[PDB]
């Protein structure tokens, strides 16, 4: 059984890393990116990144994004 | 079958019955699994994001309440450094099927349409120990009520092996009157 002191911590890790319309980025090589999370992205959006590059999502894999 | 879910489970068991906790570690692995159900507990673990750092230190907290086995503690501490744990499920329940190899036991499935009891069990487990070779035999039941009187077993290796009589006598009747 998981105590009160770690399950309201390991959602405290979760809340963060799950934004809605942001994701984190796995890979980046040669022209690609794999993104962790955006889950609400669609097939073609526009999709903007830290340092300010813009991508366009193509592969909506179960996992991660294309 | 050799996958990577099963060959680490099968690992795990084999450290088990060298030290002889087999027992013991069992009891740890059912643990877990309640633990890896939750849909946001498994989440933390499997996903790539977050920290591997920080994993450690939540699954240490997991382990001291749960009270963990030491190889069982390892185990996990194994998964998540050579990056497994998104097939965390498919290895504790793994493991299950390689337990009862160890132990010389077989399991079977008997279903009916009302509950029964345990005279009628045992003997069950008598001819499936007789026909299957279990060192020991073991059993489930599961009530299902669209069938009509019957009781079907299931056993083997895999969920395999199927003898019943139910409704198999009527779809055998049809079969049979279409000759």
Redesign the interface.
Known sequence: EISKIIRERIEGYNREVKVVNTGTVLQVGDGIARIHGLDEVMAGELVEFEEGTIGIALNLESNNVG | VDSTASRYASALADVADVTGTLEATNSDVEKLI??FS?E??Y??FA????SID?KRS?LD??IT??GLQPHTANFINILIDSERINLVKEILNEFEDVFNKITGTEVAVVTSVVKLENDHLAQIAKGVQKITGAKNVRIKTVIDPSLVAGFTIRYGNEGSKLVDMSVKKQLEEIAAQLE
């Open positions: 309640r633990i939750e946001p507990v989440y933390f996903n790539p994001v977050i920080n939540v907290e997991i309440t749960s």
